Design an enzyme around this catalytic site. Structure first.
Site, mmCIF file in Angstrom:
data_model
loop_
_atom_site.group_PDB
_atom_site.id
_atom_site.type_symbol
_atom_site.label_atom_id
_atom_site.label_comp_id
_atom_site.label_asym_id
_atom_site.label_seq_id
_atom_site.Cartn_x
_atom_site.Cartn_y
_atom_site.Cartn_z
ATOM 1 N N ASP A 61 14.633 -12.776 -13.849
ATOM 2 C CA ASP A 61 13.401 -12.292 -13.229
ATOM 3 C C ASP A 61 13.775 -11.704 -11.857
ATOM 4 O O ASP A 61 14.870 -11.967 -11.315
ATOM 5 C CB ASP A 61 12.327 -13.384 -13.114
ATOM 6 C CG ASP A 61 10.894 -12.831 -13.257
ATOM 7 O OD1 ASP A 61 10.721 -11.587 -13.288
ATOM 8 O OD2 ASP A 61 9.932 -13.638 -13.351
ATOM 9 N N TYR A 83 11.713 -5.250 -5.997
ATOM 10 C CA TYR A 83 10.808 -4.869 -7.068
ATOM 11 C C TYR A 83 9.613 -3.993 -6.693
ATOM 12 O O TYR A 83 8.949 -3.434 -7.586
ATOM 13 C CB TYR A 83 10.305 -6.109 -7.817
ATOM 14 C CG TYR A 83 9.243 -6.899 -7.104
ATOM 15 C CD1 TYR A 83 7.923 -6.459 -7.064
ATOM 16 C CD2 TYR A 83 9.554 -8.098 -6.493
ATOM 17 C CE1 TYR A 83 6.929 -7.192 -6.432
ATOM 18 C CE2 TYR A 83 8.566 -8.858 -5.858
ATOM 19 C CZ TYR A 83 7.249 -8.400 -5.830
ATOM 20 O OH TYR A 83 6.267 -9.174 -5.222
ATOM 21 N N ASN A 87 0.486 1.915 5.773
ATOM 22 C CA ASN A 87 1.184 0.909 4.942
ATOM 23 C C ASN A 87 1.976 0.043 5.951
ATOM 24 O O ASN A 87 2.898 0.537 6.623
ATOM 25 C CB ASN A 87 2.149 1.527 3.908
ATOM 26 C CG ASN A 87 3.103 0.472 3.250
ATOM 27 O OD1 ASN A 87 4.246 0.783 2.893
ATOM 28 N ND2 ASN A 87 2.614 -0.752 3.076
ATOM 29 N N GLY A 88 1.543 -1.205 6.145
ATOM 30 C CA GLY A 88 2.216 -2.091 7.085
ATOM 31 C C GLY A 88 1.312 -3.195 7.613
ATOM 32 O O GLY A 88 0.367 -3.610 6.934
ATOM 33 N N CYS A 119 0.882 -1.216 0.000
ATOM 34 C CA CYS A 119 0.000 0.000 0.000
ATOM 35 C C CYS A 119 0.895 1.233 0.000
ATOM 36 O O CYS A 119 2.082 1.135 0.331
ATOM 37 C CB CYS A 119 -0.886 0.028 1.244
ATOM 38 S SG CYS A 119 -2.036 -1.342 1.357
ATOM 39 N N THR A 146 10.899 -4.783 -14.107
ATOM 40 C CA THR A 146 11.915 -4.463 -13.114
ATOM 41 C C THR A 146 13.300 -5.035 -13.435
ATOM 42 O O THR A 146 14.305 -4.327 -13.296
ATOM 43 C CB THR A 146 11.445 -4.857 -11.702
ATOM 44 O OG1 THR A 146 10.595 -6.007 -11.776
ATOM 45 C CG2 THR A 146 10.643 -3.733 -11.098
#
Ligand SMILES: O=S(=O)(O)CCN1CCN(CCS(=O)(=O)O)CC1
Ligand SMILES: O=S(=O)(O)CCN1CCN(CCS(=O)(=O)O)CC1
Ligand SMILES: O=S(=O)(O)CCN1CCN(CCS(=O)(=O)O)CC1
Ligand SMILES: *CC(=O)CC[C@H](N)C(=O)O
Lengths: 492, 500, 500, 492
Positions: free
Chosen positions: A366, A258, A101-102, A1, A304
């Site tokens: 990747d 990423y 965010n967490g 988030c 990425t």
């Protein structure tokens, strides 16, 4: 988030919206913006969808004021796509809104205590709602009005003593202003910036990533320190205060792999430069362990990994080629009457340039491997395109354990590397060769950019959770939450 | 614009929708899909917006049938966001629908003839509706049913003698099948693919680019030849025919520079390789001409120039670094009363990694320069991020002329390169240095992938128009179309605001 | 269905939209409005839903021009909610759009001829699209431009010789004007009105009912005569012409019973007065035939029968009381997993005032009885609210035959009165008594308002079809159309549910 | 506004939706439904629009549970069309939601006390949000868990001692159940009903009007007494308790004139029968004061007046004719570019049957006269249709004062009868004659149905506000609220 907060001297609605469009990669399931108006009332708009779809002109007109916060959601256990999004809100004491965010590792116990000691009801299963209610509960211990900056910091400190986990938070208290605070381990990202309007007027803002400050013309000030709290009054006065004991910097190593944008600087480290370093490390490991292999070209799996793979090809003295093109526009699959609903594909997200694999031994790069599903299909696509030997290298080490600090990961059972060695993982995904970045190499790749960081949050890789409160019982608890989120989303 | 047509043996709605998603880069203004159901009737869903927004479950349910065509729109003169999107339709003769990527240089005259001779009304300002009506009128010349393949080809041939310009079309005729055809000069892209199901049951498909065949698992067969037409009956039979007098292969060189997807093969030329070759050529030119310059790094302006700049950095033996990141998500700028401190236009598109410019003489690489406005802004962004010298290299030669073949480009006086030397452009955009790809180099870079193509469509670069019917009267007429288009879009905004 | 056409001197969008709102009772399934803008092009907005929901500001902005037509849809065999709504369109010859209220009894044959002779494709199952194509083909017979009024009338006349059934149409031809015409038997309603602006600048309008002229402040001129056509040029000139061989006035008697608005004058007959007369007739019949019965009160089943029941109560010298209230707002019944205690179908529509039925022999009055299902339910509702005897009187005679002229009615075997005596129907619906209006009384009740009409359209009542082309093969074909319509509506529901 | 609450033994979402569709005439600006789910969490959907437009299948699927309440809003001062609709919600104590039909005359003082003594923030300007917060605040004085029915009644009683005004309320408290209570003067309407599912299971429901019970098959029990409170546990146990001192019945007389549905029985009085009685009274007054007038026909102005006018025509021995037809479908007027935006019309809502006015002296009947705007235009339409003399009779007496108890009325200045005599009002609207129902006649018309009612709430007619706290200062305060609501709606 991703979160954003702007304490300005002029309407912030467009600016918060703009900051959220550059933090969109942190979550695309829902978005929310809440501002305080000229009347000291919150105006809110939050809903499922991308930011550009959630906020129409009419919602923008309603979001009046010079102070506001925003959130973009990435679905997690407890906060399914069907559940109420952020920011959350409470009406007492004073009126408080918060975006987070967490993840709190002791959410369930906190919710029990809130219900039993304060009679505060939690309507969702989101630990952010619980976080808001603990803070609110701590702010409610004040008689005098208004609250001084000392009382707000005292409430956050008391909060830090109760909750455990990872969290980058931003909130607003009516009649007071904006607060932002970070967990005592500095796991989740959060920066502070400012914008000088004139000799006497300076606006402030906090965001999960520095790109939100850049896009708005805000000057970068610094990361909000672990355990630190920032308070900006209504009036534009800035206060800062360390609100935790024994604060230390353990930034989430995963953000760098990423999750974050390459142009962000998280805890003094350029994400882009850290990623190039990962390719340097991985390239050196490949040149050492795979000296005798015939590799004709290095092909990144977008997006990425393109830079990481470029660095690897450079180190290996092999050509770098765009063998895979990521489809920027992906659509949905429709459940139609009579028609057979066939295949869940990676071909919807990726296309193989046929000419780039033909009769070649290809080294695919990747960023990481989780379920192993996509890599399996990608390797398959390489073979269909005529590739002889197909090798795969992962910028990140094996992902064996679940993340309980904010990053969404499936349960340990669904992680291909969990309980498996490299060769077995390789046989399952059907690769001719598989090589992962060594954890200590990942650490050095990132640390090289800021040697002041001694240890990062590396749980998904080593199973060591810094908050020391994670065991199988808890992980099982989290799985039951996913099961309930599933039933809810299935329903919609 | 991008087109797709699939003549299958099972439901085509999901497949057409998926093909358009990978052709989405050819136009994001509108999208349309039309199918022929089990009752020989058209089912259609077209509207403004991305493919993913235009088609919802209720629309897909009505798009039944095993054959259908699709289109995604890039707005051009005569086809604004406000106007009706493709595919277009007519009910006589038979019921015909068509989708087109290109532009008819004699649209005006065709419209007059259609009115005077056939009393066929054209409701929009789109030459694609006109093209459909010429096609429809030529098909109205037969008195036996059903039409034979030869009749349908005769009609396409008659059409080609009447129309001029550039076009890649796919159409469907109720009771017969799907047809596809390309202009006599092979200007607009169009490929054919197939998918075998069993003994004598193959599905066929045509699309603007091969990535559409790839994504659906179709075997690429070949490009539709210039002036050729393909015809696939409802029963699954394939027929083709050269429907032009003197077909030549003059592929639009622009598709290669940045318009098409790098994973596409257009006329046997890999777009990706051609662009890598574009870097090799421009790098050698820079090595030769800018030898005395100290450049510390090569930074692409995303996204098309990443591989081109990589190649340039390789030839120059200089590091390649991601200095600019393109914001994958761009939002709307709402017109609010007194928008205090507006976010910079360029910042909406890109973001600079401060660390990559600080105290560096940077060489930026962009695919082309049109108006020159955003270039000046990017240059400014670099100096602001700390650069000392800022040089600009363009993978495309100078863009000096308008394109009247289907690519949207402003008028001649709006093109910064128009009537100016490289050094004048440099001064205007504020670069310390400016260098353009040489046209013959661009040509060799693409031709290297297929020496059979001897001549490309280069009008935007050299002012040479193969149809030889582009004069000022025509250019001015296109400007008129653009102005009326603007009025229609402006009106649409007016009460969208007042409704509040 | 309801139609409207306005040929004005100032913008018609708001006015057409307003006219449809007062014609909204003729169909709430879909709505459509099309105009001719300043550039001689059609602008259109049609979709499912009420007028107020279908047309939003962005749609009204595009509906520019001083002439236009509108339509509201009632779904019938061949035109389900799922199918394309009116008005329909064709681009050749000239550009023609049409809106129609009625039904063509030879639609099938017309469609075959259109295909075979003209290669004109019909995309929907609506005879209104066929009607437009016959009209369009007849207009394609002239070789001079523009067409003269006489040519346009010649085409309508040719059309009338080809088509059979019932129709009220309004259409527009690009570059010429608006036309309106009515079937040779004057079955479907259609009136003409005007609005003077200044010396030789009058606006004209046609609509299904006069309330549409009233609401827009237009002076009512007269009903369009049977078989007559009206033509209003873009320049504001009026022309008319009888376009039928043997026109007769046989107005649909159903419009009077309940379909039209009471404030309308259809063929010089006030709908309101006719309904009051319907009460006078039915009350005298009841007085004569139910003389031995004790009825305490007369209660209408809202809304059409309120004034009819008042009149009946007046003749019987019995009190009139509002026993049932119709729920002005009805919602959707969502199909939820295990819908425990479902709310009764009848209760969704009505509500009973308990006090008005308790220990009373009640006489209920409804406009008609079709299937008889809701009647049985209303009767039950009354006994439940405490009634002792419950008698039912129907303002319309027994409904025994299907209507093939534009009014949606089920098939013959679905009509409860079909093949049954009044006493059998009574037993089935559970009334203590049932009485129907006598057909000749209904006729006298309406005719009293205009003795010039000597014969009405009564097929639903007596099985006599004026077009004399209604046989079982045709009825069966209509049933086929209805079944395909149902499948299309069922499919649409299927994933609307699955999308959840 | 209209409210509904259902304490059932099976999903209530469709039933609440259905009850709201028959109470739709009480407010069409917004609707809201909130249920308590199997998890003891509220699920909510509220938005602007008719009920049938607000609740789509997806919202219905989310509204899970066997207990829930609903609301349909009629815009008023403080609750503009742009503001958050009902039901309102609070998370502490326990989680409480409430829907309200009425108005608190001391809202402003209550909001001050809430802020100063409890730090409870009010985000809207709706007195219903304030009502919810006073109740919540009173419920928060309890230590033991769960609350007994005695504590809930004690909180409502304490609430009744603080708030003043008119109110019919329904609420739900998580983990407890549903409560419904009425003001001590019985001004706003509220009935109670039940539905026996089996030998051991009985569902309960409360609604503004009895029609909501009828449509669902619920048996009418009784009106909720003035000051009384009803509490239904989770478990389906019913409790009732008088929660006010000196409760008396002063039902709003206005509800009977045109607001309520004719099929409802409010405080033992049939609205329909009371309306027929009004026509009886008005007819007798006309036959007495207008004996010499030449009247050819009586024509009601739809729709409430049709029965009233029918009774008048009967009393007068004159024919009743449908001269006016109400347009059931009304659309909006569009602000288009270049086009002149002309006339605000009554012709959009009403059509005149031309043949019914021609060369006749017509007596038009309407339910009441407020601004006088429409009546003016209607009389005009009668003349255009060819009417000679046009007379108008009002079923209600002069409306001279503003309603502060829940019914929306414009300010005293905008009321044509305010400060004007009958003849002047008549000259302004341009009628040949004007006659109003006498207040004491209206009282007897309604009272005849239930002689137990001694006095009704008649403020809009006589300026006597039973709560004794209304003066010009307060009415001016209300006008400033309308001014702010206007700026907000104008904005949208
Ligand atoms: O931002 S806006 O004001 O536009 C929408 C407000 N938002 C709508 C959805 N609900 C949760 C639904 S439920 O979980 O209670 O069903 C939270 C509040
Ligand atoms: O005239 S046409 O039928 O071609 C145009 C028919 N139109 C599409 C509806
Ligand atoms: O703050 S503002 O005044 O701007 C908007 C008020 N907001 C509107 C949306 N609803 C929830 C919608 S739903 O959850 O009922 O769908 C909560 C209240
Ligand atoms: C409602 C009506 O008149 C039907 C028109 C025509 N029959 C049709 O389109 O179905």
């Amino acid at each position: 988030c991703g979160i954003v907060g702007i304490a300005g001297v002029m309407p912030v609605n467009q600016s918060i919206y703009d900051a959220l469009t550059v933090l969109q990669h942190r979550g695309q399931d829902a978005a929310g913006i809440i501002t305080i108006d000229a009347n000291n009332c919150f105006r809110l708009r939050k809903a499922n969808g991308l930011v550009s779809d959630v906020f129409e002109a009419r919602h923008m007109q309603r979001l009046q004021g010079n102070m506001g916060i925003g959130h973009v959601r990435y679905p997690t256990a407890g906060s399914s796509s069907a559940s109420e999004a952020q920011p959350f809100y409470v009406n007492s004491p004073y009126g408080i809104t918060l975006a987070h965010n967490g993840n709190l590792t002791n959410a369930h116990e906190l919710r029990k205590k809130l219900f039993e000691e304060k009679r505060r009801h939690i309507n969702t299963t989101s630990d952010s709602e619980i976080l808001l209610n603990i803070f609110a509960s701590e702010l409610d211990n004040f008689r005098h009005y208004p609250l001084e900056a000392d009382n707000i910091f005292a409430a956050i400190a008391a909060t830090n003593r109760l909750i455990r986990g990872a969290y980058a938070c931003v909130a607003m208290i009516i009649g007071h202003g904006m607060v932002a605070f970070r967990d005592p381990n500095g796991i989740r990202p959060l920066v502070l910036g400012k914008r000088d309007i004139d000799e006497n007027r300076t606006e402030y803002m906090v965001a999960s990533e520095s790109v939100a400050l850049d896009t708005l013309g805000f000057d970068f000030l610094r990361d909000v320190a672990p355990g630190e709290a920032i308070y900006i009054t209504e009036e534009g006065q800035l206060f800062t205060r360390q609100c935790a004991d024994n604060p230390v910097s353990n930034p989430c190593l995963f953000e760098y792999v990423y999750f974050a944008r390459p142009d962000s600087f998280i805890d003094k480290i350029s994400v882009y430069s850290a990623r190039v370093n990962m390719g340097t490390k991985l390239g050196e490991k490949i040149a050492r362990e795979w000296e005798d292999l015939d590799i004709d070209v290095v092909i990144p799996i977008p997006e990425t990994s393109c830079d990481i793979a470029l660095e690897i090809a450079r180190i290996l003295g092999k050509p770098y080629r765009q063998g895979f093109v990521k489809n920027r526009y992906v659509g949905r699959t429709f459940i139609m009457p009579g028609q057979q609903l066939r295949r869940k594909s990676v071909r919807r997200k990726l296309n193989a340039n046929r000419a780039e694999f033909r009769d070649k031994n290809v080294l695919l790069v990747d960023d990481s491997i989780v379920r192993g599903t996509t890599s399996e299909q990608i390797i398959e696509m390489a073979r269909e395109a005529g590739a002889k030997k197909v090798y795969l290298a992962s910028a990140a080490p094996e992902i064996r354990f679940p993340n309980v600090y904010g990053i969404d990961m499936p349960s340990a059972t669904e992680l291909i590397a969990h309980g498996r060695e490299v060769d077995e993982i390789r046989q399952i995904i059907g690769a001719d060769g598989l090589i992962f970045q060594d954890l200590n190499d990942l650490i050095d790749a990132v640390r090289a950019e800021n040697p002041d960081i001694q240890q990062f949050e590396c749980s998904v890789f080593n199973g060591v959770y810094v908050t020391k409160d994670v065991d199988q019982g808890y992980l099982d608890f989290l799985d039951t939450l996913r099961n309930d989120d599933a039933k809810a989303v299935q329903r919609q």
